[PDB]
Amino acid sequence: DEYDYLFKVVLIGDSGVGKSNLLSRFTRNEFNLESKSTIGVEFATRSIQVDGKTIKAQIWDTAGLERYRAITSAYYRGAVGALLVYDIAKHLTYENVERWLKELRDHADSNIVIMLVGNKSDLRHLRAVPTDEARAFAEKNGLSFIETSALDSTNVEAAFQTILTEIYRIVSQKQ
Amino acid sequence: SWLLRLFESKLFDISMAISYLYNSKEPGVQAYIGNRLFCFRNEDVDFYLPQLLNMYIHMDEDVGDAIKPYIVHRCRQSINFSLQCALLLGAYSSRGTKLRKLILSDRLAPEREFIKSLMAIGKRLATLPTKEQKTQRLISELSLLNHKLPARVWLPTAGFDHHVVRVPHTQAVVLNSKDKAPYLIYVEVLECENFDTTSVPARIPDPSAVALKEPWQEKVRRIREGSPYGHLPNWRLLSVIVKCGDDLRQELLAFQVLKQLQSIWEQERVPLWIKPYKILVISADSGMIEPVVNAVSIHQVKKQSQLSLLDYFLQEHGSYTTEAFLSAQRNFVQSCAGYCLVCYLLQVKDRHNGNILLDAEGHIIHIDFGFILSSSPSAFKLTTEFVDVMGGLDGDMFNYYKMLMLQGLIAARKHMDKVVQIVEIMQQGSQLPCFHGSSTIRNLKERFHMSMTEEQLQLLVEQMVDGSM
Ligand SMILES: Nc1nc2c(ncn2[C@@H]2O[C@H](COP(=O)(O)OP(=O)(O)OP(O)(O)=S)[C@@H](O)[C@H]2O)c(=O)[nH]1
Ligand SMILES: [Mg+2]
C-alpha cells in the first residue's frame, strides 16, 4: 500500500564537508575517500517506520559550490528537514554555518527542522572546532546537534533518525 | 571502499602512507593520512622525516598543510625533533622559512651556540696546512669550550636523550690536512629518560690525557678514569666527526638507502653485511657524522703495517687454518658482497682504499657516499688484493661471494619500491648533483631488472663480477 508520510530532507553545507558520503553511508552503507564534487544535486531515499506509521525519507544532497547554488535553492521548497553539515577539521566551514542558516531561512520554510552536523570526527588530531562551542551555538539558535563520521559510520543513522523522528513529532503535534 | 579497506588493513605502514600522500591529489586522502601520521610510532616516521619535510617545502600547499599538524605536534613534544626540523628545513630550501623561524622562536639557544662554536673551530683550522698543527689548535680551541659546559646541549647523533657535560679536548684529532678539514671529537654526556623533562647537571672540576691509537673500549676506560663525571653510572661517552665544509645531504640519502637495503636483506634472511653510520645535516655546506669505532681505511692499513691485505689478514687474524682468519674471511666476503650491491644500485663513484674501511672483525665499510647516482667526479672494483683475501677466483668463498650478491639482488627486487621511494621523494625540487639527469629514477629502476628471470639475474651478476675486475 501507500506510505504514511513523505519527508523531504536536504543536505546543505560547505563543499567538501562530507554530505555525499553521509548520504551514501546512511542509504547504502558505503564510503569513498576520493569522492568528487557533487554536480547540482544527488538523490537518495530510505523508508523508516515511526510509531506504526511508514515514512519514506527523500534525501537530496545539495551542492556546496556556488555553481549550482540557485538549483539547490529549489530543493529548499517543500523541505521539512535540513542537515547543516560542517567539517571539524576546517574551521571556515563552521564559520559559514551562519550563512547557510540565513540562506536556509531565506529560501525555505521557517518551521523547518535543522540538524547541525559536525562530520569527520575520526580526524581527531586535525580538529579545528571544539564540540562544546558547536553545541553551544546549536542550542543558542534552537538547532539540533551531533558530530558524525561517514568514514567509520559513527552517529550517522543516529543523526538521520533523530531529525526524522523530530520531524514526525512536530508534524503529529500540530495535528 | 577498496581504498578505505586498504588504508585500514595491516598493509598500511608509514611507507605506503607517505607514498599515497605523495601521489594522491584528493584532499580527503591527504587529510586522512595527515591525521593517520599521529597513529604511527615516532621512530617509524623519524626515518622518513627528510622526505616529509622535502614534500612540505617543494610541493603544493595541500600536502604541506596535511603534514604540518604532525610536525608541529612532534616539535612541541621533542626539542631534538625541533632542532632536526629547523636544520632540515634550512638545508633543503633554496616555503618552510616561516615554520623554521617559528620552531626556532619556540630555549634552543645553547644548542645553536654549541654547534656554531664547533663549526667556527672547524673553520679556524684553515690557516694550518698540516694535520698535526690543525690538531694542536683544535685541542686548544676545544679546551675553551669546557668552560661553557654543562648546558642544555646534546648530540643528535646519539640514540638516547642526554646532556653534554664534558669534552676531553686532548683526545680530539683532525682527520686530514685539507682546507675545510673534518675533525673527530669525543664528548662526555649524561643519559636521561627524557631531555625535555630533566634540567642541566651541575659542574664538577696529567695522567690520562694522552691520545693513543687504542681500541674504543680502552679509550672509554682511559677518558672515564680521568673524568670528573666518570664515577657516575649516568656517564656515557660519545664520538662525532665535525665537518664544517661538507655537504652531507647525498650522504643522508645514501644512509637511508643503506638502512633500507639492510632491513630488506635482514627480512629476506640474506647474510649480507653493511654498516650504515648516522648522518646529521646541519646546513647545505656543513654537518656531523657518527664514526664507526675500531675501523681504519685499507690505505692506512697497508701503510702502517706495510703489508698486502692478505698478509695483514694473516698477521692480524692468523694463518689459513685458524678460526679467526676463517671468520674474518667470511665477514670480508659478506661485507664485500653487500657493499658491491650498494655501490651498484646507488651508482657510488670515487671508490678507493681511502674510502673503504676495515674493522677488527674483517668487515669492509664504505664511507664518504658523495657522488652517487647521477653525479660523477671510478666505481667500485674487485682488485687482485680483495680476490686474494677471498681465496682466489675458483675458491669457495668467491663463489659464495657472487651467490651472496645474487641473493641480495633478488631480495632487493622483492622490495624494490621501498628503496626507489626514498630516492624519488628526495628528488622533488632538488638542486643536488645526484639528480643532474632527468631520468635518475628510471635508471635506478632499470638497475633492478624487474623484467629479468632468476637465470638472467645470475648471468647479470656474472657479468657484473667480470666487469668489476
Ligand atoms: N575522515 C573522514 N573523511 C571524510 C568523511 N566524510 C567525507 N570525507 C572525505 O571528504 C571528502 C569530501 O567529501 P564529500 O562527501 O564529497 O563532501 P560533499 O559535502 O558531499 O561535497 P559537495 O557535494 O558539497 S561538493 C571526500 O574525499 C571524503 O573522502 C568522514 O566522515 N571522515
Ligand atoms: Mg558530494
Residue numbers in the entry:
A (entry chain F): 6 to 180
B (entry chain E): 128 to 221, 232 to 243, 306 to 404, 512 to 683, 691 to 782
Task: List sentences quoted exactly from the publication behind this structure.
In this article, we describe an application of hydrogen deuterium exchange mass spectrometry (HDX‐MS) to identify dynamic regions within type III phosphatidylinositol 4 kinase beta (PI4KIIIβ) in complex with the GTPase Rab11. All deletions were then combined into a single construct that contained two internal deletions, as well as removing the N‐terminus and the C‐terminus. This construct, referred to from now on as xtalPI4K (HsPI4KB S294A 121–784, Δ249–287, Δ408–507), enabled us to generate crystals of PI4KIIIβ in complex with Rab11.
The higher resolution crystals of the PI4KIIIβ bound to GTPγS‐Rab11 revealed novel molecular details of the PI4KIIIβ‐Rab11 interface. These crystals revealed formation of a helical element (residues 70–77) within switch 2 (residues 72–82) of Rab11 that was not present in structures of Rab11 GTPγS alone. To examine if this conformational change occurs in solution, we examined the H/D exchange information of Rab11 in the presence and absence of PI4KIIIβ, mapped on to the structure. Notably, there was a decrease in exchange in the region from 72 to 80 within switch 2 of Rab11 [Fig. 6(A)], and there is no direct contact between this region and PI4KIIIβ. Intriguingly, the combined crystallographic and dynamic information from HDX‐MS revealed conformational changes in the switch region of Rab11 upon PI4KIIIβ binding. Switch plasticity in Rab11 binding interactions has been noted for a number of Rab11 effector complexes, specifically in Rab11 bound to the motor protein myosin V,30 as well as in the complex of Rab11 with FIP3.42 This intriguing observation that PI4KIIIβ changes the conformation of the Rab11 switch regions both in solution and in the crystal structure, suggests that this may be a mechanism of how Rab11 could be biased toward binding specific effectors. The fully optimized xtalPI4KIIIβ construct in complex with Rab11 formed crystals in the absence of small molecule inhibitors, and crystallization was amenable to soaking with a variety of small molecule inhibitors.
